[PDB]
Amino acid sequence: GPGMGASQDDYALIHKNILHSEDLLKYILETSVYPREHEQLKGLREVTEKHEWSTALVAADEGLFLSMLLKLMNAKRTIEIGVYTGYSLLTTALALPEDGKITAIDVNKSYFEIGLPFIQKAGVEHKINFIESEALPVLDQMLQEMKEEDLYDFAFVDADKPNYANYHERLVKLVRVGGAIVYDNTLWFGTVAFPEYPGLHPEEEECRVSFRNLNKLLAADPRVEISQVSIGDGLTICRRLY
């Protein structure tokens, strides 16, 4: 719609971190991440770093953390909401077993085609089923067709941030009991810690208010036990109880 420019350069929080020191984040990346990063994940990240929406790319240290979660819970069927160029999608496909399956949903396949060559040369494209659509209509039709023995083990939510609460009401019925739902950016550059934060782009302000509402909602939801982790831009792990 008509209005103000909503490009990445129009944003205010691009360079703000939740860690105190930029040295500390670089230490973690140089010491414990880059020596453990797949060669194709490195290539996908370096291309994405130059993209016009580079701020949406998931942090590399967080990627190695999501891979650890998938392996420890022995996930085999997962769903990803928000693919972009596919860093977390490639991370997920590399962690799953050979017969693992992923449902990847994004409104823009042009983003996904940027990282598709890296995914292919990693040899894990066969696990991925890409759905070019809005995520909410896909999840609602899944509610129509999913049987209990088809429920997902793991779900990464990283698409349109104000819609997390809407995705939640579907994913607690699409993920198995004891499965995991992870919401990304739940600390939003640290702006959620304050009732008001001046000088944000209108869309950044919408995310701050929506994340402050989601965090209260997740902490009070009896269907789930939560864990908010201050890695990357912050994430909340959600385990379905019933």
Ligand X SMILES: Nc1ncnc2c1ncn2[C@@H]1O[C@H](CSCC[C@H](N)C(=O)O)[C@@H](O)[C@H]1O
Write out the binding residues.
58, 84, 88, 106, 134-135, 158, 160, 184-185
Residues 188-227 touching ligand X, rule: CB under 6 A, are none
45 with 88: CB under 8 angstroms?
no
> Is residue 70 at the binding interface for ligand X, with CB under 6 A as the rule?
no
Q: Which does 135 bind (CB under 5 to 8 A by kind): Mg ion, a second copy, ligand X, none?
A: ligand X
Instruction: Give the C-alpha separation, 46 to 55, whole Å.
Output: 13
Q: Does 56 bind ligand X (CB under 6 A)?
A: yes
Interstrand relation of 235-240 and 224-229 (parallel, antiparallel or unpaired): antiparallel
DSSP reduced 3-state for 130: strand
Specify whether the CB–CB gap between 152 and 238 falls below 8 A.
no
97 sits near a second copy (criterion: CB under 8 A): no
Q: How many residues bind ligand X (CB under 6 A)?
A: 19
List the strands of the sheet with 128-132, edge to edge.
128-132, 101-106, 77-81, 152-157, 175-184, 235-240, 224-229
Stretch binding ligand X (CB under 6 A), from 23-31, 100-108, 122-130, 186-194: 100-108
Residue 115-154 contact track with a second copy, rule CB under 8 A, x = bound: ----------------------------------------
CA–CA distance from 193 to each of 2, 93, 155, 189 (Å)? 31, 34, 26, 9
- Per CB under 6 A, residues contacting ligand X are 56-58, 82-84, 87-88, 105-108, 111, 134-135, 158-160, 163
